[PDB]
Design a protein around this ligand. Structure first.
Ligand SMILES: CC(=O)N[C@@H]1[C@@H](O[C@@H]2O[C@H](CO)[C@H](O)[C@H](O)[C@H]2O[C@@H]2O[C@@H](C)[C@@H](O)[C@@H](O)[C@@H]2O)[C@H](O[C@@H]2O[C@@H](C)[C@@H](O)[C@@H](O)[C@@H]2O)[C@@H](CO)O[C@H]1O
Ligand code: CA
Ligand code: MG
Ligand code: MG
Ligand code: MG
Length: 142
């Protein structure tokens, strides 16, 4: 059971590197359009263990994180073998779930057991692969 407000919208975001103009803030702009050409999808360099993070600004009790994958270019696969991690205000892990793939689905809903965290991080565990997210939405436990 989760609230409906997406508390990641408009928050500070960052990522391991930036390529092709794909600013980290594109995953928290309020627009889940998955076509990279419509400018709302992030992109890091091709690198090992690429990551992306949003700072919620305060510790919140997180119940759901929703990832929206890139959809154009036949490169949706790059979002595979990754972790979704929640960190506290000291940047220590308070929760971690691993996923092998989204299975062609355009989105992934990740549920957390009422976890108090300030940061939400997506981490690829693959070599030489860029991280691109169309949007990451985060909802409080109800
Ligand atoms: C190979 C590469 O990175 N080329 C860049 C380019 O992106 C490619 O553009 C073509 C059409 O010309 C296709 O849409 C390809 O799918 C696309 O390559 C994909 O997307 C890029 C961003 C990378 O992730 C890449 O590895 C991948 O295969 C890019 O073109 C722009 O962005 C694309 C998606 C598209 O909307 C274009 O029409 C657009 O102008 C350009 C300019 O940003 O940069 C190239 O280096
Ligand atoms: Ca977006
Ligand atoms: Mg278009
Ligand atoms: Mg344009
Ligand atoms: Mg910060």
């Amino acid at each position: 059971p989760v609230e409906t407000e997406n508390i990641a919208r408009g928050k500070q975001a960052s990522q391991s590197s930036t390529a092709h103009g794909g600013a980290a803030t594109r995953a928290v702009d309020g627009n889940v359009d998955s076509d990279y050409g419509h400018h709302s999808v992030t992109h890091t360099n091709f690198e090992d263990n690429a990551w992306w993070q949003v700072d919620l600004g305060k510790t919140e009790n997180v119940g759901k994180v929703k990832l929206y994958n890139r959809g154009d270019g036949n490169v949706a696969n790059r979002l595979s073998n990754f972790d979704v991690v929640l960190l506290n205000e000291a940047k220590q892990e308070v929760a971690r779930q691993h996923f092998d793939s989204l299975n062609g689905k355009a989105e992934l809903e990740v549920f957390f057991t009422a976890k108090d965290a300030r940061y939400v991080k997506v981490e690829l565990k693959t070599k030489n692969t860029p991280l691109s997210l169309a949007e990451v939405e985060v909802f409080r436990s109800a």
